[model samples]
Target: ACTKNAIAQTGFNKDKYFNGDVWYVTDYLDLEPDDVPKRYCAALAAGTASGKLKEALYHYDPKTQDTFYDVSELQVESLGKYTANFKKVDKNGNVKVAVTAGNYYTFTVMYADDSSALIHTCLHKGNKDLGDLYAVLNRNKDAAAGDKVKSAVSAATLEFSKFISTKENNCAYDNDSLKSLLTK
Candidate 1:
């Protein structure tokens, strides 16, 4: 369901009205249910006119049960499940990488011909938060911890960090305050 057909449009296409567009998911990471993984986008907005998205970052608070976007000062008591759809191949039939998660945030690159994508998601349990999740995961592999949490943290650190290090995506965000926290 990730691939989508172009839509017809006729309008002012401005602040008044604009056709919504779609972004394909090429990569993603989901922390354990307690971690609440959130997608950080390059462009300030997800709307079609928000311009090109070059990179996607995943952020989670191990201690907070609530969801928030610090730069925007936006918060939610809770978040529900969500899904991302993307094309596995491009117009030339080149296959694209895909990332899957239970309910992570996702974003599409502005230029369709680009090589990669920014995708993310999270799992949520009743009232638990992952305050010490990362701290625990960064411990020695032989450290004593539940198998599930241990495995989740290990995969996130290794896989997610590797993904970011590649820097294959565009991420053109230039705000000092916004990039300060995610300037890797």
Candidate 2:
């Protein structure tokens, strides 16, 4: 269902991006909404622990009061692209749903700077085929998309106007839990 094989960042810097910090989704465009609420919130922490790459994710939908957490071990596809096998986890990193077939996502970093990034992900869960999700992320949860990442969105042939902002979702994250999951 994913439409574009999104281009990765030219000369992407892996270290700075997977630097054990949270990247909050300030805005997102979900191509195939697939029977979900329109307003959504998401955030992730990417880090390398003991030479292994990991990512912890949090997604919330205020409209439906739905939330989930996942921790994934990432395998590199290239410099800035990866395939992640994920297991659903609780806030404390206890595995709730063990990683199984179709419980994975492809990740691509289209652009990244010290404080902001533009990335894409497509999560295939069980029988639900999905589409591309383009997210504009910021280290600061409420920060606006800077010029650079906005331009990168345009370069992807996506209209920035279609993206939904999570700014007013009353979103809050469990920072400590996400950070602790890196080594789990």
Candidate 3:
């Protein structure tokens, strides 16, 4: 039987997570399962589409207190299973478009034909912040030998990877060692 090394918050690290008030996942990634530079974040959901998302950008805005913004015209280009770009939309429905290819936008371009089939999408950080993050990533899509945005995106990507890993560990199967041994 093979076992994988998973990163999880032990009772020692429980203080960081208070009263379920924080976002957490159990599976965290590592270059070698215990390497340094272990990225940190709250919660991350990859491939947040399909079935209901329908090849569209799900906008989540936190600036408005209780509003979720989405853009339906962009496809999240994924290196793995999911990709997301960020763009900001103001209260008047005006978007603050940044100059970046595949930048994040707060307009969800659903494949649906109707103009009023809004779905509830949750934003991680809320508001135009997601858009800003996307824009930065897009800006350096073609960075030369050394670029700033690329570095930033790389760091962010690691954080995202860790976040995904955490989720996997949290929801992973719980195997009973005694039961497995007896079966063998």
Candidate 4:
């Protein structure tokens, strides 16, 4: 019933996951609204950017039945020995968000090409547990999503760099090699 409510509320496609693909879901909101959490996820997806990194964030609020979505670009200004500095810019180049990579929760799935990455860092409302469950379901071998849900690194649990060589809890990315470069 819980999973059903989550799926129904979020309108997420389980059929797609059955086909061995990645899906990002949108639903609910944190009590205090802010962009930093979303930005942190964006930075994780942008991972070690040599140039601009682009990603879209989808948000929904069940209490108000409202939805908010935006596409933002990120640039890594400095890659320190243990951390990175980033800037998030919108289409108008008007909204600039400054952030450090280590401060918030982050989960990312790297693509074949280093530049194109998909980040699933929606820590909204009750979705944190939902997200974790979804990742777990997909992680089961021979399950839907073709075993593709394996290789995600998260900052909420441990240091961002700890996942560099570990394969535990990685269920939606292509590589972990890049994590080493991003972490201290």
The lDDT leader among the candidates is 2
C-alpha RMSD of each candidate structure in angstroms: 18.3, 1.0, 20.2, 15.3
What does candidate 1's lDDT look like per residue over 1-184, in tens digits? Answer: 1222212112212221111222222223333433323432222222222342212222223334322222111112222112233222222223343432332322211111111222223222234342111122111212233444334434434333422121233322223322332211
TM-score of 1: 0.18
Give the TM-score of each candidate. Answer: 0.18, 0.96, 0.20, 0.27
* Candidate 4: RMSD to truth: 15.3
- Give the range where candidate 3 is weakest over 10 consecutive residues by summed lDDT: 111-120
- What does candidate 4's lDDT look like per residue over 12-82, in tens digits? 22223222222232111232333423211111222322343433332333334343333333332222101
Query: What are the lDDT figures for the candidates, one per model?
Result: 0.26, 0.91, 0.24, 0.26
- Tens-digit lDDT track of model 2 for 16-106: 9999999899999999886666778889999998899999999888888788999999999999999999999888889899999778999
Between prediction 2 and prediction 4, which has the larger lDDT?
Answer: 2
Task: Give the poorly placed runs of model 2, Cα more than 4 Å off.
Answer: none
Residue 51 Cα positional deviation in candidate 4, in Å, after optimal superposition: 6.4
